[PDB]
């Protein structure tokens, strides 16, 4: 029934074995999607590198506590997000960068982008890690200019603590599910290890929740 088709079947089986091994190796990695607006401050987040010519997508590869992270930056597309966002359906988490130092209502467009991304039909289960960058510059700005320029309905005083808490809580309340996804927030600091530790903790929590769903405990 086969003369030298047996060797073709053997080659196909070897190809299947290689594919299975590569798939397992790829599945043993953590994948994150980095997102934000212009001047958001993604540089201070991607500067934690610990490991191309195409301006289509950037892949940052690093590791921490033996865990392997690959972060995808898609800020060089300038197209409609609905055309290519579905490619990132299965990412472990989104990493949203928001600059606190903004005024051309930049914070308003950042909030609009966050609302659009959070309530997307594809990211109904992926968690979001919010990075509020440039806290010191925001402190100087609020010492100089009132926060009422961006939010005229602010009732509190003008100090770094309560203003930062108000911005954080408003961004958290911008979520419209609050039952299937979580938002982890951090204020980016000068220490290069605290940010990565926070990312690791959030990723561990997301993995635990996903395993809870897989094991039938949810």
């Amino acid at each position: 029934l086969s003369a030298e088709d047996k060797a073709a079947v053997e080659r196909s089986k070897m190809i299947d074995r290689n594919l299975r091994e590569d798939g397992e190796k790829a599945a043993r990695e953590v994948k994150l999607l980095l997102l934000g607006a212009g001047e958001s401050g993604k540089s201070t987040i991607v500067k934690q590198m610990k490991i191309v010519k195409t301006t289509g997508i950037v892949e940052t590869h690093f590791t921490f506590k033996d865990l392997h992270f690959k972060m995808f930056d898609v800020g060089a597309q300038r197209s409609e997000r609905k055309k290519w966002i579905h490619c990132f359906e299965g990412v472990t988490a989104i990493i949203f960068c928001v600059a606190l130092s903004d005024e051309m209502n930049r914070m308003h467009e950042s909030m609009k982008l966050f609302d659009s991304i959070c309530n997307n039909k594809w990211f109904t289960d992926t968690s979001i890690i919010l990075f509020l960058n440039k806290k010191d510059l925001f402190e100087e700005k609020i010492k100089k200019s009132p926060l009422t320029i961006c939010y005229p309905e602010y009732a509190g005083s003008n100090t770094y603590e309560e203003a930062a808490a108000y911005i954080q809580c408003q961004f958290e309340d911008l979520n419209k599910r609050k039952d299937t996804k979580e938002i982890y927030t951090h204020f980016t600091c000068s220490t290069d290890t605290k940010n990565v530790q926070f990312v690791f903790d959030a990723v561990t929590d997301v993995i635990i929740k996903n395993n809870l769903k897989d094991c039938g405990l949810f």
């Binding site: 043993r28 953590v30 506590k65 033996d66 865990l67 392997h68 990723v203 561990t204 993995i207 635990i208 395993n211």
Partner: peptide, 8 residues
């Protein structure tokens, strides 16, 4: 979870 994720 994180230990078995690396080398499950």
């Amino acid at each position: 979870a994180t230990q078995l994720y690396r080398r499950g």
